[PDB]
Design a protein around this ligand. Sequence first.
Ligand SMILES: Cc1c(C)c2c3c4c1OP(=O)(O)Oc1c(C)c(C)c5c(c1C4)Cc1c(c(c(C)c(C)c1OP(=O)(O)O5)OP(=O)(O)O2)C3
Ligand SMILES: Cc1c(C)c2c3c4c1OP(=O)(O)Oc1c(C)c(C)c5c(c1C4)Cc1c(c(c(C)c(C)c1OP(=O)(O)O5)OP(=O)(O)O2)C3
Ligand SMILES: OC[C@@]1(O)OC[C@@H](O)[C@@H](O)[C@@H]1O
Ligand SMILES: OC[C@@]1(O)OC[C@@H](O)[C@@H](O)[C@@H]1O
Length: 90
Amino acid sequence: SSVQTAATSWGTVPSIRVYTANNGRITERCWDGRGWYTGAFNEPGDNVSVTSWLVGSAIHIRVYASTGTTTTEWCWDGNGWTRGAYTATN
Ligand SMILES: Cc1c(C)c2c3c4c1OP(=O)(O)Oc1c(C)c(C)c5c(c1C4)Cc1c(c(c(C)c(C)c1OP(=O)(O)O5)OP(=O)(O)O2)C3
Ligand SMILES: Cc1c(C)c2c3c4c1OP(=O)(O)Oc1c(C)c(C)c5c(c1C4)Cc1c(c(c(C)c(C)c1OP(=O)(O)O5)OP(=O)(O)O2)C3
Ligand SMILES: OC[C@@]1(O)OC[C@@H](O)[C@@H](O)[C@@H]1O
Ligand SMILES: OC[C@@]1(O)OC[C@@H](O)[C@@H](O)[C@@H]1O
């Protein structure tokens, strides 16, 4: 009935990323100080969570995308989104 979001931020500008699961697809909206724009993330999922951390000034983002009982981790480390090693307890 309602879309599901996850958000993360870094720095003091700040940079913000908001991930929205709608219709089985997760997309990404970005804020870097001058208006919201669309980011490169696009993966299947009904539910989403996110966390991020800085190494110096480089951001690292991990998005956990779930469909059914399957969760896939997606990794941003500065040069494209790549599948992570995450698997669940099951
Ligand atoms: C795709 C999808 C998601 C992501 C859902 C739900 C449903 C869902 O299937 P959908 O095709 O929408 O079928 C439904 C329809 C047509 C109606 C009228 C429903 C529900 C669903 C079931 C139950 C439902 C759900 C909710 C929430 C917050 C409410 C209020 C809520 O009651 P309400 O809106 O009165 O009743 O959780 P949420 O939307 O996050 O999860 C559960
Ligand atoms: C009107 C306007 C233009 C046409 C600019 C720039 C700025 C600008 O002023 P404004 O946007 O008000 O203030 C800024 C704000 C609020 C932020 C957060 C800025 C920048 C500016 C400065 C710096 C900046 C500029 C860039 C580019 C490509 C980047 C990535 C870029 O770093 P960004 O992460 O955005 O940081 O060049 P651009 O051709 O856009 O030139 C330079
Ligand atoms: O500048 C936008 C961008 O490169 O920021 C890092 C990640 O959020 C990417 O998905 C996104 O496209
Ligand atoms: O560099 C990617 C990676 O090693 O980063 C740390 C964890 O997110 C791992 O699952 C992931 O594969």
